[PDB]
């Protein structure tokens, strides 16, 4: 394509969600986009095409526009059943292919949102005896189900050896997800501190460990 889509939109139960889509003069607007719906464990489907037309079975809660120079998609009376990754299409005569912007995840807030409770677990005694070390950040009790996680060592951002999971549902209806940093016994022991920074909505939750200390 030419331009990418915003990663996600988050709006509440019975509200109207707004999903944006941009491109060049021969795609998305003047050569109008179609919108799609795919959630994990469900088949993908077409929502709208050719200005604001809809496939059979798709309700009047869906609308769209080509206004000014962009495409957009409107979801009124917003429900948990609408949640999915939503995609906006193009073709261009210089890029002669089935391409698309990027996909905007749709979030429905059916309950109050909050930042996570985070506990950071240092590398344990069994890992060091195995000549291994993993610093593990467990992020729990958050809503909605998406956070951004960064690692630091002493005072610097850490990019090497970083991997994460998706969230699962808790028995009390909140989300929990994990993040891992891969270290050698020498990398853990040579530092004064490490931390996990978890950004959620308008705030960040940070937890710390000390390789030089004990309890």
């Amino acid at each position: 394509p030419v331009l990418t889509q915003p990663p996600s939109v988050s709006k509440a139960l019975r509200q109207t969600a707004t999903l944006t889509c941009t491109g060049d003069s021969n795609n998305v607007g003047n050569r109008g986009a179609a919108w799609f719906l795919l959630h994990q464990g469900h088949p993908p489907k077409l929502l709208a095409y050719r200005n604001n037309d809809r496939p059979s079975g798709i309700s009047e809660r869906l609308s769209a526009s080509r206004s000014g120079n962009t495409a957009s998609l409107t979801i009124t009376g917003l429900q948990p059943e609408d949640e999915a990754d939503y995609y906006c299409s193009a073709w261009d005569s210089s890029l002669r292919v089935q391409v698309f912007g990027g996909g905007t995840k749709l979030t429905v807030l059916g309950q109050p949102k909050a930042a996570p409770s985070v506990t950071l677990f240092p590398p344990s005694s069994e890992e060091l005896q195995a000549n291994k070390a993993t610093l593990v950040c467990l992020i729990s009790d958050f809503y909605p189900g998406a956070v951004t996680v960064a690692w630091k060592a002493d005072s610097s951002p850490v990019k090497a050896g970083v991997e994460t999971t998706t969230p699962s549902k808790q028995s009390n209806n909140k989300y929990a997800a994990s993040s891992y940093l891969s270290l050698t016994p020498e990398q853990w022991k040579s530092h004064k501190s490490y931390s996990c920074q978890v950004t959620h909505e308008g705030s960040t939750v940070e937890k710390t460990v000390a390789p030089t200390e004990c309890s």
């Binding site: 795919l38 095409y49 292919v97 409770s117 291994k132 593990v136």
Partner: protein, 222 residues
């Protein structure tokens, strides 16, 4: 309405060939493109798109190299024929209709369910299991937040519980994540009264059923 129906499974060993179809209901090939797409888990959609006769002259130059992503069609109707396959070809494959020309139109009018295609020669592998303990009652949030690290195992399913099944009511499981190595990472947390930190050491019981690998570890503050 128009509908599509895809085949399940999709599990092969390296160097084999996968052969399947997607059924078309309410129409046939002529007058439309008919194409596939795929989504690797944790990533977005990748092109298996616009059809020109049985194959295509309008493709992604970055994908049509290795076994030339040879899904294509059979007499212009839906099919897949991927030969000499490897682990890097793993994804969920979908069938759909759309527009035509050298052009997708812009619509993709009908879609299928997705084929869960995956390839591996490996036997089932048990996890490396390590205990996770809190540093203090203040930093754990007053109550005792206890856990366990379960890493480098395959396939995805694994059972994690506590005290040989005696401690289950406060136990929570986090989702497994797949890494570039082909192995999974998972953790758990259980919440208990903070008075037990200096009274009862807790046992986390990890059992990888696909391999019968059962490893327990003891969790206490240090």
């Amino acid at each position: 309405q128009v509908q599509l129906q895809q085949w399940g499974a999709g599990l092969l060993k390296p160097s084999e060939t996968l052969s399947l179809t997607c059924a078309v209901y309410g129409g046939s090939f002529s007058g439309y493109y008919w194409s596939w797409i795929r989504q690797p888990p944790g990533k977005g959609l990748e092109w298996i798109g616009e059809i020109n006769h049985s194959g295509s002259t309008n493709y992604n130059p970055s994908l049509k190299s290795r076994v030339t992503i040879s899904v294509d069609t059979s007499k212009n109707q839906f099919s897949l024929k991927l030969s000499s396959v490897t682990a890097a070809d793993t994804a969920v494959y979908y069938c759909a209709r759309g527009g035509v020309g050298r052009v997708r139109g812009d619509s993709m009018d009908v879609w299928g369910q997705g084929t869960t295609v995956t390839v591996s020669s490996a036997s089932t592998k048990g996890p490396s299991v390590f205990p996770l303990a809190p540093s203090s009652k203040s930093t754990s949030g007053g109550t005792a937040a206890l856990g366990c690290l379960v890493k480098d195992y395959f396939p995805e399913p694994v059972t994690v519980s506590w005290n040989s099944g005696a401690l289950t009511s406060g136990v929570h499981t986090f989702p497994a994540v797949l890494q570039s190595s082909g192995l999974y990472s998972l953790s758990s947390v259980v919440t208990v009264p903070s008075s037990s930190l200096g009274t009862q050491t807790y046992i986390c019981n990890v059992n990888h059923k696909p391999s019968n690998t059962k490893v327990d570890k003891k969790v206490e503050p240090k």
